[PDB]
Structure 1
Amino acid sequence: AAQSIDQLIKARGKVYFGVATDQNRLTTGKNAAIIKADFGMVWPENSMQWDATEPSQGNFNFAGADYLVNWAQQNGKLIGAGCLVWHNFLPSWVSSITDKNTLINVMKNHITTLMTRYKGKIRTWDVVGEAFNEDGSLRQNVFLNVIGEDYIPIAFQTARAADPNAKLYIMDYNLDSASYPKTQAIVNRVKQWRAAGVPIDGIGSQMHLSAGQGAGVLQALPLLASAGTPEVSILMLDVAGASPTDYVNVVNACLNVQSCVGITVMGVADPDSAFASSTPLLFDGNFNPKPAYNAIVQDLQ
C-alpha cells in the first residue's frame, strides 16, 4: 500500500526521512503535499546559504529562510539548515577578505547570527561543508587560505556557543567508498578534532550518486561512523537512473549503522532536480512514487 517512507523509517528506529526544499518549491505544484505526506524533515537548499543571508558584511536577510523555518513549524516538520562555512554560495566580499582575524570575526558573526535567530528550533546545522580535497588534504577555500586549518575548530566552537542543543555537522561528498582517501581522511581529521575538543556531533555524507555506487556505501558509512561522532547521516541523496538497488543499498547502510539518524534526499520530483535528465529522485514528473520509492517502502517493512 501507499506509505510514507518517513513514518516507516521512524518505525525502524531512525529519526527521519527528509528532503531539501525552499519557498520557490513549496509555493508551486505538488511539492508541499508530497513533503507533508512522506517526509519528516526539511532543509533549505539555498535560503540559508551565505549569499542569501549576508549579501554584504553585517547586513543580514532571512526572507527565504524564515519562510522555510516557519513553514516547517506550521506543518510539523523537523528542520536542518546550512551551510554556515563552505565555498559554495559564498559571496565574493567574503572570499576577498585577506587577513586571518578579519575573516575569523566575519565567520563567527555569520555563524552566531544565523544560529541565534533560530535557536532551539533547528535539529541539525551543517557548520562546515566540502572542506576536503579528493586526496584527503584540506580544500584551499578562503577559510583555509586566510584563517588556516584552525577555521574548523573555530567554526564548531562558535556554533556550539550559539545554540548548544543543535547537532553540529561536517559534511562532504565522495565519501562513498571505504577505500577512497577522502573518506579515510575525514575520519582521521574528525578523530583529531574531537580529541582536541572540537564539538563535531555528526558527519553528513552528501550522496550525489552515479548508478551502482550504492553498494560501496555499505562499508563507507560504518567507516565514517568510526570517527566517534554521536551521529552520522545521509544528505543530498540522488542516484542517476534511480535504480531500486542503489536506493535500497543506501537505506540498508543507514539501517546497519547505529549512529545513522536519517536520510535526506536532494528534492522531490525528477524534472525539478538539477540533474533532471538522469531522473535521479524518488518521484517522477507526475509526482508519482517511482519503483525506487516502492522498493524503499518494501525494505522498511
Structure 2
Amino acid sequence: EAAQSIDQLIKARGKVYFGVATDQNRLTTGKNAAIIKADFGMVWPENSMAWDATEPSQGNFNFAGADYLVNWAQQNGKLIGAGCLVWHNFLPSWVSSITDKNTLINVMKNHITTLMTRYKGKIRTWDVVGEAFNEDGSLRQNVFLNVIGEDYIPIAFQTARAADPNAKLYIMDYNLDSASYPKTQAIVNRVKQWRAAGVPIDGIGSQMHLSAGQGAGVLQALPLLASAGTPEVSILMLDVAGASPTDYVNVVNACLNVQSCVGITVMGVADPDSAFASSTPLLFDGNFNPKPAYNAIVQDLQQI
C-alpha cells in the first residue's frame, strides 16, 4: 500500500528520521529487517554499544555486536545513533569500583574516545551522557558523580566532540514527560548552563517509556526541553503501555510541533521483543503486523 513508511512520511514533514533500536539478533529473526528497511530511517544498538558489552575489562573492547549493527545500517542506507557512553546502567564492576578521580576521568575518556573513534564519521547521534538526573532534579550520584564530581558531564561532552566532531552529542534521560516535573525543569536549566559554558551538548533526548495516557503531557514537555536551546531534541526509547493511538499520535505531534525535534526512535519493532511485552507497547504485534497505533501515526503524518 502507498505511503505506509513512517520514516518516509516524517521526512516529508521535514524531520530527519523515524528510528528504532535493534541489534544483530533482531535483524536475523522475525520480520525486523524487512520492517526496518521499509519503515524506519535510523537504527540504534538496543544493547551492543553498552559499556558492559563493549569494554568488559579495562581497556579491552568488544566491537563485534556494534560492528554488525553499523555495517547493516550502512548497507541498508540507515542513519545510526549510538549510546550510551556514560551512564549508570550496564557498568562493569571494574568501572564501578574505581575511586580515584583522575583514573575514572581517564577510563571514561578512553571509553568515549575508543568507541567514537572506531565509528568516526558514521554515527549521526551519540548519546554521550544518560540518566544523569535524580527525580528531584539533582544530579544522580552515580560512580562518575561520586568520584569525579559534576565535571564528568562537561568532560564527557568535550571528549566526545574531540573524538568525532561530526556527531551530534546528546544528553538523555527518562521521566522528562511532564512539563511540571522537577527532573524535566532541571535538565533544561542545567543544559542551558552547560551550553553557556561552551559544553558541546547538541541535543536532549527524551527516553519516552510511557504509561497509558502520558502522551498528552509530552505536548508540553517536549517544547520545554527544546527551550534549553540545544540545536536538536529527540524522542528516544519510545514505547507506550497499551499502545493507544492517542498516546502515540500525541507524541508524534509533539515532535512535529517542536522545530528542533529531529526525530523519534522507538524502543523496538514488535511487542514480544519488548522488555515490557505484557504491556504490548510497540507498533507491531507478535505476528509483525502493524497495530492501530502504527496506522494512526501514518494517518497523522500523511499530508498538494
| TM-score under structure 2 length normalisation | 0.98
Structure 1: how far apart are the matches of 2:11 and 2:221?
A: 23
DSSP 3-state at the match of 2:251: helix
DSSP 3-state at the match of 2:141: coil
1:83-142 Cα distance to aligned partner (Å, 9 max, x none): 000011111100100110000000000000000000000000000000000000000100
User: What is residue 177 of structure 1 aligned with on the other side?
Assistant: 178
Structure 1: how far apart are the matches of 2:224 and 2:137?
A: 15
Aligned partners of 2:44 and 2:82 also within 8 Å: yes
Structure 2: how far apart are the matches of 1:206 and 1:61?
A: 26
DSSP 3-state at the match of 1:164: coil
1:247-276 Cα distance to aligned partner (Å, 9 max, x none): 000000000000000000000001111101
User: What is residue 236 of structure 1 aligned with on the other side?
Assistant: 237
Structure 1: how far apart are the matches of 2:10 and 2:60?
A: 40
DSSP 3-state at the match of 1:198: coil
Structure 1 runs (4+) deviating above 3 angstroms are none
Structure 2: how far apart are the matches of 1:101 and 1:188?
A: 28
DSSP 3-state at the match of 2:289: coil
Displacement of 1:13: 0.2
Displacement of 1:172: 0.1
Structure 2: how far apart are the matches of 1:27 and 1:129?
A: 29
Aligned partners of 2:3 and 2:9 also within 8 Å: no
Structure 1: how far apart are the matches of 2:51 and 2:249?
A: 34
List aligned pairs for 1:129-140, cutoff 5 A: 129-140=130-141
Displacement of 1:214: 0.2
Displacement of 1:2: 5.9
1:29-71 Cα distance to aligned partner (Å, 9 max, x none): 1111111110000000110011111101111110100000000
Structure 1: how far apart are the matches of 2:155 and 2:15?
A: 30
Structure 2: how far apart are the matches of 1:242 and 1:59?
A: 40
DSSP 3-state at the match of 1:248: helix
1:220-260 Cα distance to aligned partner (Å, 9 max, x none): 00000000100000000000000000000000000000000
Structure 1: how far apart are the matches of 2:3 and 2:89?
A: 37
DSSP 3-state at the match of 1:261: strand
Displacement of 1:21: 0.5
Displacement of 1:24: 1.1
1:149-202 Cα distance to aligned partner (Å, 9 max, x none): 000000000000000010000000000011000000000000110111100000
Aligned partners of 2:238 and 2:266 also within 8 Å: yes
Displacement of 1:72: 0.4
DSSP 3-state at the match of 1:8: helix
Structure 1: how far apart are the matches of 2:263 and 2:161?
A: 22
Which shows bigger deviation, 24-33 or 244-253? 24-33
DSSP 3-state at the match of 2:193: helix
Unmatched runs of 5 consecutive residues or more in structure 1? none
DSSP 3-state at the match of 2:199: coil
Structure 2: how far apart are the matches of 1:58 and 1:279?
A: 39
Aligned pair count reads: 300
Aligned partners of 2:170 and 2:202 also within 8 Å: yes
DSSP 3-state at the match of 1:220: helix
List aligned pairs for 1:114-133, cutoff 5 A: 114-133=115-134
1:14-38 Cα distance to aligned partner (Å, 9 max, x none): 0000000001111111111111110
User: What is residue 46 of structure 1 aligned with on the other side?
Assistant: 47
Structure 1: how far apart are the matches of 2:52 and 2:88?
A: 11
Q: CA RMSD in A?
A: 0.6
Aligned partners of 2:21 and 2:266 also within 8 Å: yes
